[PDB]
Structures are given as C-alpha cells and as structure tokens.
Short mmCIF file of C-alpha atoms in Angstrom, two decimals:
data_model
loop_
_atom_site.label_atom_id
_atom_site.label_comp_id
_atom_site.label_asym_id
_atom_site.label_seq_id
_atom_site.Cartn_x
_atom_site.Cartn_y
_atom_site.Cartn_z
CA UNK A 562 -17.96 -6.07 -6.80
CA UNK A 563 -19.45 -3.06 -5.47
CA UNK A 564 -18.07 -0.15 -7.11
CA UNK A 565 -15.42 1.71 -5.05
CA UNK A 566 -16.06 5.92 -5.64
CA UNK A 567 -12.44 7.40 -4.25
CA UNK A 568 -12.53 10.82 -3.95
CA UNK A 569 -8.42 12.01 -3.88
CA UNK A 570 -8.87 15.48 -2.48
CA UNK A 571 -5.75 18.22 -2.52
CA UNK A 572 -5.99 20.72 -0.25
CA UNK A 573 -4.60 24.21 0.26
CA UNK A 574 -4.21 26.48 3.83
CA UNK A 575 -4.07 30.06 3.94
CA UNK A 576 -2.26 32.38 6.23
CA UNK A 577 -5.90 32.90 7.94
CA UNK A 578 -5.95 29.43 9.31
CA UNK A 579 -8.91 28.11 6.53
CA UNK A 580 -8.55 25.20 3.72
CA UNK A 581 -9.91 24.60 0.13
CA UNK A 582 -10.15 21.90 -1.13
CA UNK A 583 -10.99 19.91 -4.22
CA UNK A 584 -11.41 16.98 -5.71
CA UNK A 585 -10.77 14.50 -8.58
CA UNK A 586 -13.15 11.56 -8.41
CA UNK A 587 -11.96 8.12 -9.80
CA UNK A 588 -13.47 4.76 -9.52
CA UNK A 589 -12.49 1.41 -8.63
CA UNK A 590 -14.21 -1.61 -7.10
CA UNK A 591 -14.11 -3.45 -3.63
CA UNK A 592 -12.76 -6.55 -3.68
CA UNK A 593 -13.79 -9.63 -1.33
CA UNK A 594 -10.55 -9.65 0.44
CA UNK A 595 -11.65 -6.73 2.17
CA UNK A 596 -15.22 -5.36 3.60
CA UNK A 597 -17.74 -3.34 1.93
CA UNK A 598 -16.86 0.07 3.75
CA UNK A 599 -15.82 3.23 2.99
CA UNK A 600 -12.37 4.29 4.13
CA UNK A 601 -10.27 7.65 4.17
CA UNK A 602 -6.78 8.49 4.79
CA UNK A 603 -3.74 10.44 4.52
CA UNK A 604 -2.32 9.05 1.18
CA UNK A 605 1.12 7.12 0.95
CA UNK A 606 2.60 5.05 -2.06
CA UNK A 607 3.45 1.87 -1.06
CA UNK A 608 6.19 0.19 -3.66
CA UNK A 609 5.57 -3.70 -3.97
CA UNK A 610 8.40 -5.03 -2.52
CA UNK A 611 8.15 -2.95 0.44
CA UNK A 612 4.82 -4.88 2.16
CA UNK A 613 6.46 -8.02 2.91
CA UNK A 614 6.86 -10.21 6.05
CA UNK A 615 10.63 -10.66 5.80
CA UNK A 616 11.41 -6.96 7.18
CA UNK A 617 11.71 -7.21 10.55
CA UNK A 618 11.07 -3.66 12.10
CA UNK A 619 9.55 -1.63 8.65
CA UNK A 620 9.44 1.88 8.59
CA UNK A 621 6.89 3.69 10.96
CA UNK A 622 3.42 5.05 9.65
CA UNK A 623 0.77 7.36 11.29
CA UNK A 624 -2.33 4.54 11.65
CA UNK A 625 -5.04 5.41 9.69
CA UNK A 626 -3.56 5.93 6.04
CA UNK A 627 -4.54 4.96 2.58
CA UNK A 628 -2.21 2.61 0.67
CA UNK A 629 -1.67 2.85 -2.65
CA UNK A 630 0.42 0.30 -4.59
CA UNK A 631 1.08 0.10 -8.35
CA UNK A 632 1.11 -3.62 -9.56
CA UNK A 633 3.40 -4.40 -12.48
CA UNK A 634 3.60 -6.86 -15.15
CA UNK A 635 3.45 -9.95 -13.19
CA UNK A 636 7.07 -11.35 -14.88
CA UNK A 637 8.63 -8.25 -13.73
CA UNK A 638 8.99 -9.83 -10.37
CA UNK A 639 7.96 -14.01 -10.95
CA UNK A 640 8.70 -14.95 -7.31
CA UNK A 641 6.70 -12.49 -4.91
CA UNK A 642 7.21 -12.37 -1.16
CA UNK A 643 3.38 -12.49 -0.87
CA UNK A 644 0.40 -12.45 -2.97
CA UNK A 645 -2.01 -9.78 -3.31
CA UNK A 646 -3.62 -10.48 -0.37
CA UNK A 647 -0.69 -10.51 1.47
CA UNK A 648 0.39 -7.52 1.23
CA UNK A 649 -2.85 -5.82 1.42
CA UNK A 650 -3.44 -7.85 4.51
CA UNK A 651 -0.05 -6.23 5.35
CA UNK A 652 -0.96 -2.70 4.80
CA UNK A 653 -4.06 -3.52 6.67
CA UNK A 654 -1.93 -4.86 9.62
CA UNK A 655 0.03 -1.90 9.09
CA UNK A 656 -2.73 0.63 10.10
CA UNK A 657 -4.02 0.81 6.39
CA UNK A 658 -7.46 1.72 6.50
CA UNK A 659 -7.45 0.49 3.01
CA UNK A 660 -5.59 -0.07 -0.05
CA UNK A 661 -5.78 0.88 -3.69
CA UNK A 662 -4.34 -1.24 -6.11
CA UNK A 663 -3.65 -0.29 -9.89
CA UNK A 664 -3.87 -3.61 -11.40
CA UNK A 665 -3.17 -1.61 -14.44
CA UNK A 666 -0.39 -3.75 -15.53
CA UNK A 667 -1.79 -7.13 -13.77
CA UNK A 668 -5.08 -8.20 -14.46
CA UNK A 669 -4.94 -11.47 -13.13
CA UNK A 670 -4.96 -9.41 -9.29
CA UNK A 671 -8.30 -9.40 -9.59
CA UNK A 672 -8.79 -13.04 -9.75
CA UNK A 673 -6.37 -13.64 -6.57
CA UNK A 674 -8.30 -10.72 -4.37
CA UNK A 675 -11.92 -12.58 -4.59
CA UNK A 676 -10.66 -15.93 -4.46
CA UNK A 677 -9.43 -14.67 -0.56
CA UNK A 678 -12.96 -14.59 0.52
CA UNK A 679 -12.13 -17.35 3.12
CA UNK A 680 -10.00 -14.16 4.97
CA UNK A 681 -11.87 -10.93 4.03
CA UNK A 682 -10.12 -8.22 6.34
CA UNK A 683 -11.67 -5.72 8.45
CA UNK A 684 -10.42 -2.83 6.03
CA UNK A 685 -11.80 -2.67 2.31
CA UNK A 686 -9.45 -3.51 -0.52
CA UNK A 687 -9.97 -1.65 -3.96
CA UNK A 688 -8.93 -2.08 -7.42
CA UNK A 689 -8.59 0.47 -9.91
CA UNK A 690 -7.16 0.82 -13.83
CA UNK A 691 -6.99 2.25 -16.74
CA UNK A 692 -7.14 6.36 -17.05
CA UNK A 693 -8.72 6.38 -13.12
CA UNK A 694 -5.21 4.64 -12.32
CA UNK A 695 -3.34 7.19 -14.54
CA UNK A 696 -5.27 9.87 -12.23
CA UNK A 697 -4.10 8.45 -9.08
CA UNK A 698 -0.54 8.10 -10.05
CA UNK A 699 -0.02 11.65 -11.17
CA UNK A 700 -1.51 12.93 -8.18
CA UNK A 701 0.96 10.38 -6.18
CA UNK A 702 4.20 11.30 -8.09
CA UNK A 703 3.22 15.38 -8.74
CA UNK A 704 1.49 16.38 -5.28
CA UNK A 705 2.84 16.89 -1.88
CA UNK A 706 0.53 15.21 0.17
CA UNK A 707 -3.59 14.23 -0.34
CA UNK A 708 -6.40 12.94 1.32
CA UNK A 709 -8.46 9.74 -0.24
CA UNK A 710 -12.17 9.13 0.41
CA UNK A 711 -13.27 5.73 -0.70
CA UNK A 712 -16.92 5.20 -1.07
CA UNK A 713 -19.17 2.36 -1.07
CA UNK A 714 -22.82 3.12 -1.40
CA UNK B 1300 14.90 9.74 -15.19
CA UNK B 1301 15.85 6.04 -13.03
CA UNK B 1302 19.32 5.87 -12.78
CA UNK B 1303 21.60 2.17 -12.09
CA UNK B 1304 17.96 0.16 -13.25
CA UNK B 1305 17.61 -3.02 -15.12
CA UNK B 1306 13.94 -3.03 -14.99
CA UNK B 1307 11.73 0.32 -14.56
CA UNK B 1308 9.12 2.28 -14.26
CA UNK B 1309 7.51 5.95 -14.11
CA UNK B 1310 5.94 5.07 -10.56
CA UNK B 1311 7.55 2.98 -8.56
CA UNK B 1312 11.09 4.06 -9.92
CA UNK B 1313 13.84 1.41 -9.99
CA UNK B 1314 12.47 -2.65 -9.90
CA UNK B 1315 15.68 -4.67 -10.37
CA UNK B 1316 19.49 -3.11 -10.14
CA UNK B 1317 22.34 -3.57 -11.80
CA UNK B 1318 23.94 -6.49 -9.86
CA UNK B 1319 26.63 -4.82 -8.14
CA UNK B 1320 24.26 -2.03 -6.69
CA UNK B 1321 21.78 -2.32 -3.83
CA UNK B 1322 17.66 -1.70 -3.56
CA UNK B 1323 16.73 1.23 -1.69
CA UNK B 1324 13.21 2.20 -1.27
CA UNK B 1325 13.36 5.99 -0.85
CA UNK B 1326 10.41 8.34 0.76
CA UNK B 1327 9.78 11.66 -0.77
CA UNK B 1328 6.87 12.47 0.79
CA UNK B 1329 4.12 10.20 -0.45
CA UNK B 1330 5.85 8.51 -3.08
CA UNK B 1331 8.32 5.85 -1.98
CA UNK B 1332 10.31 4.60 -5.02
CA UNK B 1333 12.69 2.05 -5.91
CA UNK B 1334 16.32 3.02 -6.24
CA UNK B 1335 19.72 1.16 -7.60
CA UNK B 1336 22.79 2.42 -5.38
CA UNK B 1337 26.03 2.09 -5.14
CA UNK B 1338 26.10 2.97 -1.34
CA UNK B 1339 23.26 2.72 1.25
CA UNK B 1340 22.81 6.75 2.73
CA UNK B 1341 23.63 7.07 6.50
CA UNK B 1342 21.63 4.77 8.77
CA UNK B 1343 21.97 1.83 6.61
CA UNK B 1344 24.29 -0.62 5.45
CA UNK B 1345 24.49 -2.90 2.32
CA UNK B 1346 23.44 -6.58 1.55
CA UNK B 1347 24.52 -8.66 -1.15
CA UNK B 1348 21.34 -11.67 -1.37
CA UNK B 1349 21.13 -14.20 -4.32
CA UNK B 1350 17.85 -12.93 -4.68
CA UNK B 1351 19.35 -9.08 -5.17
CA UNK B 1352 21.83 -6.75 -3.43
CA UNK B 1353 19.36 -4.57 -0.49
CA UNK B 1354 20.32 -1.65 1.73
CA UNK B 1355 19.27 -2.52 5.30
CA UNK B 1356 17.87 -0.94 8.23
CA UNK B 1357 20.66 -0.10 10.46
CA UNK B 1358 19.65 -1.79 13.95
CA UNK B 1359 22.46 -1.24 16.41
CA UNK B 1360 22.28 0.44 19.89
CA UNK B 1361 22.93 3.80 20.14
CA UNK B 1362 24.73 3.91 16.52
CA UNK B 1363 23.70 6.58 13.68
CA UNK B 1364 25.37 5.19 11.17
CA UNK B 1365 27.06 2.13 10.46
CA UNK B 1366 29.23 -0.11 7.98
CA UNK B 1367 27.22 -3.86 8.89
CA UNK B 1368 24.67 -5.75 10.95
CA UNK B 1369 27.36 -4.70 14.43
CA UNK B 1370 30.37 -2.38 12.99
CA UNK B 1371 29.39 0.97 13.79
CA UNK B 1372 30.78 4.40 12.37
CA UNK B 1373 29.22 7.57 13.72
CA UNK B 1374 27.82 6.97 17.25
CA UNK B 1375 24.82 9.17 18.82
CA UNK B 1376 25.66 11.92 20.64
CA UNK B 1377 27.65 11.49 24.12
CA UNK B 1378 28.23 7.83 23.11
CA UNK B 1379 31.97 6.82 22.55
CA UNK B 1380 33.07 5.09 19.34
CA UNK B 1381 35.64 2.17 20.27
CA UNK B 1382 36.55 -1.20 18.26
CA UNK B 1383 33.00 -0.95 15.81
CA UNK B 1384 31.03 -0.46 18.83
CA UNK B 1385 29.31 2.17 20.94
CA UNK B 1386 29.95 2.60 24.51
CA UNK B 1387 28.76 4.90 27.37
CA UNK B 1388 32.20 5.98 28.66
CA UNK B 1389 35.53 4.76 26.85
CA UNK B 1390 36.30 0.89 28.28
CA UNK B 1391 38.88 -0.40 30.77
CA UNK B 1392 42.24 0.01 28.88
CA UNK B 1393 40.78 2.37 26.72
CA UNK B 1394 40.87 6.32 26.68
CA UNK B 1395 38.61 9.27 24.62
CA UNK B 1396 40.50 10.80 22.25
CA UNK B 1397 41.26 14.73 22.38
CA UNK B 1398 38.72 16.74 20.52
CA UNK B 1399 36.63 13.55 19.59
CA UNK B 1400 33.73 10.88 20.06
CA UNK B 1401 36.79 8.29 19.66
CA UNK B 1402 38.35 6.38 22.34
CA UNK B 1403 41.97 4.71 22.37
CA UNK C 1211 -30.16 9.33 8.32
CA UNK C 1212 -28.76 7.08 10.96
CA UNK C 1213 -24.78 7.91 12.22
CA UNK C 1214 -22.85 4.37 13.16
CA UNK C 1215 -20.13 6.59 14.87
CA UNK C 1216 -16.81 3.80 15.36
CA UNK C 1217 -14.36 5.11 17.56
CA UNK C 1218 -11.17 3.93 17.56
CA UNK C 1219 -7.67 3.72 19.92
CA UNK C 1220 -4.49 2.35 18.36
CA UNK C 1221 -0.94 1.93 19.71
CA UNK C 1222 1.90 0.32 17.30
CA UNK C 1223 4.34 -2.51 18.71
CA UNK C 1224 8.03 -2.36 17.75
CA UNK C 1225 7.51 -4.40 14.52
CA UNK C 1226 4.48 -1.36 13.52
CA UNK C 1227 1.07 -3.87 14.26
CA UNK C 1228 -1.38 -1.88 15.50
CA UNK C 1229 -3.29 -3.13 18.53
CA UNK C 1230 -6.87 -1.77 18.64
CA UNK C 1231 -9.78 -0.72 20.52
CA UNK C 1232 -12.87 0.21 18.92
CA UNK C 1233 -16.32 1.69 20.04
CA UNK C 1234 -19.40 1.83 18.20
CA UNK C 1235 -22.26 4.52 18.95
CA UNK C 1236 -25.02 5.73 17.54
CA UNK C 1237 -26.03 9.51 16.36
CA UNK C 1238 -28.36 11.01 13.51
CA UNK C 1239 -26.82 12.55 10.22
CA UNK C 1240 -28.06 16.67 10.53
CA UNK C 1241 -29.44 17.94 6.87
CA UNK C 1242 -26.74 21.04 7.90
CA UNK C 1243 -24.04 19.21 6.34
CA UNK C 1244 -23.66 16.31 4.23
CA UNK C 1245 -24.93 12.57 4.80
CA UNK C 1246 -21.70 10.83 3.73
CA UNK C 1247 -19.54 8.49 5.68
CA UNK C 1248 -15.76 9.76 6.75
CA UNK C 1249 -12.66 8.81 8.83
CA UNK C 1250 -10.11 10.80 10.68
CA UNK C 1251 -8.27 11.99 13.67
CA UNK C 1252 -10.22 13.17 16.29
CA UNK C 1253 -10.06 16.63 17.53
CA UNK C 1254 -12.24 18.36 20.58
CA UNK C 1255 -13.12 21.59 20.36
CA UNK C 1256 -14.01 24.37 22.89
CA UNK C 1257 -17.48 25.49 21.53
CA UNK C 1258 -15.99 29.03 22.60
CA UNK C 1259 -13.17 28.20 20.96
CA UNK C 1260 -14.78 28.10 17.35
CA UNK C 1261 -15.84 31.55 16.34
CA UNK C 1262 -14.54 33.55 13.04
CA UNK C 1263 -13.58 36.65 15.81
CA UNK C 1264 -9.77 35.38 15.60
CA UNK C 1265 -8.44 36.79 11.72
CA UNK C 1266 -5.61 34.47 12.42
CA UNK C 1267 -6.10 31.38 14.11
CA UNK C 1268 -3.73 28.17 14.10
CA UNK C 1269 -3.20 25.65 11.84
CA UNK C 1270 -4.57 21.93 12.18
CA UNK C 1271 -4.04 19.18 9.88
CA UNK C 1272 -6.16 18.61 7.90
CA UNK C 1273 -9.12 15.46 7.37
CA UNK C 1274 -9.24 16.07 11.32
CA UNK C 1275 -12.63 15.13 13.05
CA UNK C 1276 -14.00 17.24 15.20
CA UNK C 1277 -15.91 16.62 18.54
CA UNK C 1278 -17.40 19.60 20.28
CA UNK C 1279 -19.18 19.53 23.82
CA UNK C 1280 -22.52 21.82 23.50
CA UNK C 1281 -23.33 23.38 26.83
CA UNK C 1282 -26.14 25.15 28.39
CA UNK C 1283 -26.93 28.12 25.69
CA UNK C 1284 -27.34 30.53 29.31
CA UNK C 1285 -23.62 30.13 29.86
CA UNK C 1286 -23.39 32.04 26.93
CA UNK C 1287 -26.20 34.47 26.16
CA UNK C 1288 -25.15 36.25 23.10
CA UNK C 1289 -22.73 33.68 21.32
CA UNK C 1290 -19.78 34.46 18.86
CA UNK C 1291 -21.41 31.95 16.40
CA UNK C 1292 -24.69 30.11 15.91
CA UNK C 1293 -24.33 26.81 15.99
CA UNK C 1294 -24.28 26.22 12.20
CA UNK C 1295 -21.87 28.68 12.50
CA UNK C 1296 -20.07 26.82 14.47
CA UNK C 1297 -19.69 23.75 12.84
CA UNK C 1298 -19.23 25.30 8.89
CA UNK C 1299 -16.26 26.73 10.93
CA UNK C 1300 -14.78 23.66 11.97
CA UNK C 1301 -15.31 22.33 8.41
CA UNK C 1302 -13.48 26.17 6.93
CA UNK C 1303 -10.78 25.18 9.31
CA UNK C 1304 -9.69 21.92 8.11
CA UNK C 1305 -12.19 18.81 9.69
CA UNK C 1306 -13.39 16.18 7.69
CA UNK C 1307 -16.30 15.72 9.20
CA UNK C 1308 -17.90 17.47 12.36
CA UNK C 1309 -19.76 15.53 16.02
CA UNK C 1310 -22.00 17.31 18.01
CA UNK C 1311 -22.89 16.39 21.43
CA UNK C 1312 -26.19 18.32 22.09
CA UNK C 1313 -26.81 16.76 25.37
CA UNK C 1314 -27.21 20.14 27.57
CA UNK C 1315 -28.63 21.96 24.32
CA UNK C 1316 -31.07 19.61 21.98
CA UNK C 1317 -32.74 22.54 20.57
CA UNK C 1318 -29.63 23.19 18.54
CA UNK C 1319 -30.79 20.18 16.60
CA UNK C 1320 -33.83 22.46 15.87
CA UNK C 1321 -31.13 25.17 14.58
CA UNK C 1322 -29.16 22.22 12.96
CA UNK C 1323 -31.52 21.25 10.72
CA UNK C 1324 -32.43 25.13 9.53
CA UNK C 1325 -28.96 24.51 7.63
CA UNK C 1326 -31.02 21.96 5.02
CA UNK C 1327 -31.21 24.76 2.50
CA UNK C 1328 -27.31 25.34 1.93
CA UNK C 1329 -25.66 22.28 2.75
CA UNK C 1330 -22.12 21.58 3.91
CA UNK C 1331 -19.83 19.29 1.54
CA UNK C 1332 -18.78 17.08 4.71
CA UNK C 1333 -20.77 15.16 7.29
CA UNK C 1334 -22.60 17.18 10.59
CA UNK C 1335 -23.45 14.75 13.14
CA UNK C 1336 -25.56 15.28 17.04
CA UNK C 1337 -24.95 12.74 19.45
CA UNK C 1338 -26.39 12.54 22.72
CA UNK C 1339 -27.36 10.80 26.01
CA UNK C 1340 -25.40 7.76 26.37
CA UNK C 1341 -23.71 7.93 23.27
CA UNK C 1342 -22.03 11.50 24.57
CA UNK C 1343 -20.81 10.28 27.86
CA UNK C 1344 -19.07 7.29 25.72
CA UNK C 1345 -17.66 9.59 23.46
CA UNK C 1346 -16.48 12.47 25.70
CA UNK C 1347 -14.88 9.96 27.95
CA UNK C 1348 -12.65 8.76 25.71
CA UNK C 1349 -11.65 12.36 24.65
CA UNK C 1350 -11.22 13.28 28.19
CA UNK C 1351 -8.80 10.05 29.03
CA UNK C 1352 -6.74 8.84 26.01
CA UNK C 1353 -3.90 10.76 23.80
CA UNK C 1354 -5.57 10.19 20.69
CA UNK C 1355 -8.42 8.50 18.87
CA UNK C 1356 -9.83 7.79 14.90
CA UNK C 1357 -13.26 7.94 14.32
CA UNK C 1358 -14.86 6.31 11.21
CA UNK C 1359 -18.60 7.24 10.57
CA UNK C 1360 -20.71 5.37 8.18
CA UNK C 1361 -22.98 6.46 6.31
CA UNK C 1362 -25.26 3.05 5.28
CA UNK D 202 -8.84 21.05 38.38
CA UNK D 203 -11.15 23.98 37.25
CA UNK D 204 -10.03 27.03 38.73
CA UNK D 205 -10.60 31.03 38.10
CA UNK D 206 -13.87 29.86 36.57
CA UNK D 207 -17.42 30.71 36.99
CA UNK D 208 -18.68 28.07 35.12
CA UNK D 209 -16.98 25.03 34.83
CA UNK D 210 -17.84 21.38 33.08
CA UNK D 211 -15.63 17.99 33.54
CA UNK D 212 -15.62 17.47 29.26
CA UNK D 213 -14.70 21.72 28.47
CA UNK D 214 -13.43 23.38 31.46
CA UNK D 215 -13.94 26.86 31.85
CA UNK D 216 -16.97 28.47 30.07
CA UNK D 217 -16.52 31.91 31.44
CA UNK D 218 -14.00 34.02 33.58
CA UNK D 219 -14.26 35.60 36.94
CA UNK D 220 -13.93 39.09 35.53
CA UNK D 221 -9.95 39.85 36.72
CA UNK D 222 -9.18 36.67 34.80
CA UNK D 223 -8.22 36.00 31.13
CA UNK D 224 -9.94 33.32 29.08
CA UNK D 225 -7.72 30.71 27.35
CA UNK D 226 -7.99 27.12 25.53
CA UNK D 227 -5.45 24.72 26.56
CA UNK D 228 -5.07 22.00 23.74
CA UNK D 229 -3.93 18.58 25.79
CA UNK D 230 -3.85 15.52 23.13
CA UNK D 231 -7.24 15.75 21.48
CA UNK D 232 -9.20 17.85 24.04
CA UNK D 233 -9.68 21.36 24.48
CA UNK D 234 -10.84 23.01 27.67
CA UNK D 235 -10.88 26.41 28.97
CA UNK D 236 -8.38 27.92 31.74
CA UNK D 237 -9.01 31.66 33.28
CA UNK D 238 -5.80 33.09 34.31
CA UNK D 239 -4.19 36.26 35.83
CA UNK D 240 -1.33 35.73 33.11
CA UNK D 241 -1.40 35.29 29.49
CA UNK D 242 1.08 32.93 28.77
CA UNK D 243 4.59 33.36 26.90
CA UNK D 244 3.19 33.34 23.17
CA UNK D 245 0.16 35.22 23.99
CA UNK D 246 -1.12 38.38 25.05
CA UNK D 247 -4.06 39.65 27.09
CA UNK D 248 -6.87 41.88 25.27
CA UNK D 249 -9.62 43.18 27.64
CA UNK D 250 -12.98 42.72 25.76
CA UNK D 251 -16.65 43.31 26.33
CA UNK D 252 -17.60 39.84 26.30
CA UNK D 253 -14.60 38.29 28.10
CA UNK D 254 -11.09 38.92 28.66
CA UNK D 255 -9.16 36.64 26.78
CA UNK D 256 -5.64 35.79 25.25
CA UNK D 257 -4.53 36.52 21.73
CA UNK D 258 -1.52 34.98 20.20
CA UNK D 259 1.13 37.62 19.87
CA UNK D 260 2.00 37.02 16.22
CA UNK D 261 4.02 39.91 15.93
CA UNK D 262 7.37 38.87 13.86
CA UNK D 263 10.26 38.26 16.86
CA UNK D 264 7.91 39.89 19.69
CA UNK D 265 7.79 37.45 22.97
CA UNK D 266 4.82 39.26 25.06
CA UNK D 267 2.38 41.51 23.20
CA UNK D 268 1.50 45.03 24.83
CA UNK D 269 -1.23 45.04 21.82
CA UNK D 270 -1.98 43.49 18.62
CA UNK D 271 0.62 46.04 17.32
CA UNK D 272 3.17 46.62 20.08
CA UNK D 273 5.78 45.03 21.51
CA UNK D 274 7.04 44.80 25.04
CA UNK D 275 9.96 42.45 25.22
CA UNK D 276 11.45 41.38 22.04
CA UNK D 277 13.60 38.24 21.85
CA UNK D 278 17.27 37.72 22.35
CA UNK D 279 19.13 40.67 20.82
CA UNK D 280 15.93 41.91 18.79
CA UNK D 281 15.87 46.24 18.00
CA UNK D 282 12.89 47.58 19.68
CA UNK D 283 10.93 50.55 17.85
CA UNK D 284 7.57 50.86 16.91
CA UNK D 285 7.07 48.56 19.32
CA UNK D 286 8.26 46.03 16.92
CA UNK D 287 11.30 43.68 16.75
CA UNK D 288 14.33 44.07 14.43
CA UNK D 289 17.94 42.40 13.55
CA UNK D 290 19.04 45.95 12.47
CA UNK D 291 17.21 49.54 13.70
CA UNK D 292 15.55 50.85 10.55
CA UNK D 293 15.97 54.30 8.84
CA UNK D 294 14.54 56.79 11.47
CA UNK D 295 15.53 55.72 14.25
CA UNK D 296 19.73 55.57 15.75
CA UNK D 297 20.07 52.28 17.59
CA UNK D 298 20.54 53.18 21.17
CA UNK D 299 22.83 49.80 22.29
CA UNK D 300 22.91 49.60 25.63
CA UNK D 301 19.22 49.88 25.72
CA UNK D 302 18.19 47.48 22.97
CA UNK D 303 16.25 50.41 21.35
CA UNK D 304 16.36 53.11 18.34
CA UNK D 305 16.22 56.79 18.63
#
C-alpha cells in the first residue's frame, strides 16, 4: 500500500471569468484492487447500494468522475449486492477515474480490497479513514461542488 | 434530519426504511443520500420487495410520470393518454378530449 | 521531467458503461509550471484567444486541460502576451493543466523555461513533432476527449 | 474552409484577417479556431482596433447588438432605449415615447 495524497480542491469563479482555488489535503492509501496511478475528477458521492449490477439502466454521469463512497458498519447491510471490489469495479465501469472508500466504519474492507489483486482495475482505488475521512465527508455535505486530485508519488 | 428512517447515517442519509415506505437515492448536487418515502416522485413508481420497498426508474415510452412498470399518468408533450399507455394520435374507436392531452 | 500524456476518447452505452479509446504520447514538463500529474476534459485554445486584453471573458468549467497550437512568431509580431503569460492565463482561467504545441515556435521552450523562478501550481507541458500531430488530430476530429498526464 | 483569411492554419483557422474584416474565435466542441468576418454576429459587436479588428461580447444588460462597449443599437423585444442602454421601464430624466421604443 503506497500512500494516496488526495487534494480536495474548492474553487470560486469571479465576474471577470477567473478562478481562485484552495486546497484541503487528505491522505489515504491505494489498494491493489486498482493501479498506482494518480487520478483527478469531479467528486460525486455514491451511496453504497447505488453501486450494483441489479439496476438495469442507472443514472448517467459524465465520464471522468471521482467516486466517494461512505461504507458503514458491515451489519447495517449483511447481504450486500457486491463486495467493495464489485462496487469499485462498477464505478470504474461507469467512468470513475478513481474511487475513494471511507472505510471508517468497516476497517475490514482494506483486507477485502488487497485480496482482489487477481483483477486489478485500470483506475486507482483509495481507502481513507479517521479525520481524513471526516474532512472529505464534510466537504461533500457542505460544498456545492469540488475537485479531487489523487496523487501517487 | 433523516426522516422515515430505521438505520441512518449523517453522510448517506437513510440506510433502511420503515417497512411500508420506499428507498429513494436522491441527488442534491454532489451528495446522493438515502430517503424513506411514501410516494415516489414524478418519473418514478413504488415497488414492494422482500429485501426492501424501492422507488424505480419510470422506463416507458414518451411518459413523464407513471404509476407502474407500464401504466402511464402524464405523457410527454404532444402525446395523447388513454388506457394507461401513451399514443401519437388517439386510437381507432377513441377521440382526444377537448382542452386535454386525454382520449376517450 | 518526462510527460506521459494519455488522450482518452469515451462514449457511453444505454447502461452507462463506457467504451474508451486511449492514445499515449510524450512531452516534457516545463519548469514554468509544476511537475505534477493531472486530469481533465480537453479544451483547445487559440493562442490569440489567450490575452489579458478582455476584462470580462466567458467562464469555462474549472478543471480543463488546455491545448494550444503555437504558430510561427512572425504571424503575430507584437503579441498580446508572452508564452508564459498565455499559460498562466489558462491556469488563471480554470485550466487544471496546460499543454503547449511548440512545433512552429520551438524557441518558446526557452522562453518558457524563463519561468522556473516563480513556478505555477499546475503542469505546463510541451510537445512537438509526431506527438503534437497525434494530439492535434484528436482535438480537430473528435467531439471530446479527456487528458490524463502523468508525472512518474 | 478558411476564408477572410490572410494567415490560415489547419489547427487554428484564421491567425490574421484581411483588414476590412473582424476577427472571431469559433468554439466548436473542444476546438477553438479563428474566423474573419464582415459582421460580428448577434451577441457580439465590432471594435476597429490598432492590432486587428475584433468582435467583443456585447454584455450590456438587455441589448442585442452593441454600437460600442457602452452604447446599444438594438434592444431586446419590449426594451426601451436610453443612453443606448435597455430598460423594461424608461427611468427618470426621460418621458417614454412609446411608439418609437425610446425615451425623451
């Protein structure tokens, strides 16, 4: 597990057309379920039950996005439609340039993710926890939009 | 807070619904949070499931809103609504209502 | 300092699965901007469309990857801006990275490396040659593409 | 596909104009390339400049074609003309001559 430098980027436009941007850094780790590649894209929150095969024609999202998934304590859903891998893989199938798992509730996932070395996806898969997780989620719940930039150094 | 909710989280909204109600994944911009709803909104229809009750995508031709898999309510503009289905012109043995998008 | 650029075509299906075409190419990371990897939707720019000469210009969506074809410097004798000037203005204007094509104006590479005193936050890349042709082709023919640039 | 054009490139279109004409950037998908025009289209206006002639965005609230940065030629439908600006109501310092779509 190499360390994932995740820079969440808030931005303003102004009447003159220009942008100012500032940067929260968080830290996570890349899993073996996905590449050691940096990624960057618009952040989109994916609910956990909202990455499954079962939905036939799910909602459409612009390609090039960043999944952020808040996993819970595993007994809150004991019969999940997929594994963490299956969701990471779905996301990527549906254009995620990368996925950020907030595993705060379920440290178990880290293990599940690196066991999926057999299929390691095109795109990177980051796990984050702790205060670093808090920041991300609050950015999500408060901010209108934002931009994630995941770095592998 | 999160309403109609059995298990719930600050971030994902509703995780399990009270049994009668339907689970709806709503987008408010960046967030997508669970909701527990009585009626699905326009463009959707309720479904009772053993796993859980769930609000599904109204997949049917030229129909803005529907009640079921294949029963329409309001058709999209210029389509005439008869018998739960949407039609281009009103069908043989049927006639469009005055001032209405509805046949007879 | 090598820039490993991926240019990526994408189209959806009805299920919202994405089939992709991916072209790689090589440039160099100019010190006028940062050495960092970056991702974004491609947007070409007229180099004459990159001047601080309009007080109010139209808003692009933050996060784009700019591509600017440089033309022989005789075609604009007294520019609205420097090369450096033009790049910084793309970044100021939302570019998450700037890709320059210095084919017709390779001296710019030197003018660009003038900026290594006060380096921009974002990647400022140069390409040329076949690599530039490959890039421009995609730009000119396709509706959209997404650039992934890696610093390794 | 490269007209009004002194200098012309396959990648950027027009780089300089024949000197009667106004310079413009066409955004066609990812592309931006130059056109040399006699008319700046609706939404824009011409500013004879020392370097070249160019079209600038008319950003006067409620004006179609600008005469200058700060003067309007054509108001949008139902918009009253004064100081070469547009109004839904003619302000103080001008009695609205209705038929003509102006103020006095």
